[PDB]
């Protein structure tokens, strides 16, 4: 139904292997789309369908926004530590924002800072003022909310415009590939024996991410057995799920795996 553009910033006080001090990825609704990091400071597409769609103009525009947000964030991680009295240690700061387009003309948005795995400070969407989660984000709350800075009215003008303008535009470019239904192969197996039997029900290769797979005995829902919905991703669009069921105490009789996915009608697979 709805579609979302959204950006994720991660900034750290000391780098490590794999991590640059600062880096960005932006999702367009499920696909990873944009990328930037502080080693070789450049904004890149991250998916074929963003390649060769916007000119050199754009991108250098984007690389400059990113090269500007980088130092103010390395700075903020050192400031945050100070409000908490920390001198040693590695520390992280995380930023999230995004717009959601939906329904008819409905717009929704969010913008939040997180210092370590804890929410620090965040924007109320109808009131349009930043509300801290913590004492230490009171001094931030006041700088930003003040008349002279007025960050609520600035980000409001981005969240209600540029973000959606850019969303609408990127949805266009990835139109052919974002709705694109691809549907599940399914491969039942049943590990081992002894008294009762295991029964794995492997579905794979599908898009979108959402599915439902039960084990049905004749015409009644079977049993839990562990994990629950662990829909795993593949390194394309595709997704994957496996449901297990400890069964036959001894009686037998016609088990079956009921898949229910957005490319279908029903789909039902029999025993062995």
């Amino acid at each position: 139904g709805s579609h979302s553009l959204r950006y994720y910033y991660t900034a750290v006080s000391d780098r490590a292997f794999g991590l640059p001090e600062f880096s960005i990825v932006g999702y367009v609704d499920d696909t990873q789309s944009f990328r930037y990091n502080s080693d070789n400071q450049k904004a890149e597409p991250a998916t074929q369908w963003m390649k060769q769609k916007e000119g050199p103009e754009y991108w250098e525009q984007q690389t400059q926004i990113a090269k500007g947000s980088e130092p103010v964030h390395k700075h903020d991680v050192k400031t945050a530590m100070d409000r908490f009295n920390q001198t040693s240690g590695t520390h992280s700061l995380q930023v999230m924002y995004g717009c959601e387009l939906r329904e008819d003309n409905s717009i929704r948005s969010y913008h939040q800072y997180g210092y370590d795995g804890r929410e620090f400070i965040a924007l109320d969407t109808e009131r349009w003022v930043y509300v801290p989660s913590v004492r230490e984000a009171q001094l931030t709350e006041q700088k930003w909310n003040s008349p002279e800075v007025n960050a609520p009215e600035r980000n409001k003008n981005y969240l209600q415009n540029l973000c959606i303008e850019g969303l609408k535009r990127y949805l266009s470019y990835g139109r052919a590939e974002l709705e694109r239904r691809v549907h599940p192969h399914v491969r039942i197996s049943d590990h081992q024996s002894d008294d009762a039997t295991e029964l794995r029900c492997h579905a794979y290769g599908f898009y979108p991410r959402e599915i439902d797979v039960k084990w049905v005995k004749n015409g009644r829902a079977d049993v839990h057995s562990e994990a629950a919905k662990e829909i795993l991703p593949n390194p394309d669009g595709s997704y994957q799920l496996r449901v297990t069921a400890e069964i036959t105490p001894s009686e037998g009789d016609s088990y079956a795996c009921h898949v229910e996915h957005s490319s279908l009608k029903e789909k039902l697979i029999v025993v062995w």
Binding site: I65, S69, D76, T79, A80, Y113, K143, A151, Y158
Partner: peptide, 9 residues
Amino acid sequence: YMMPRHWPI
């Protein structure tokens, strides 16, 4: 497009 910069915290 991504958000301009933001103030230092």
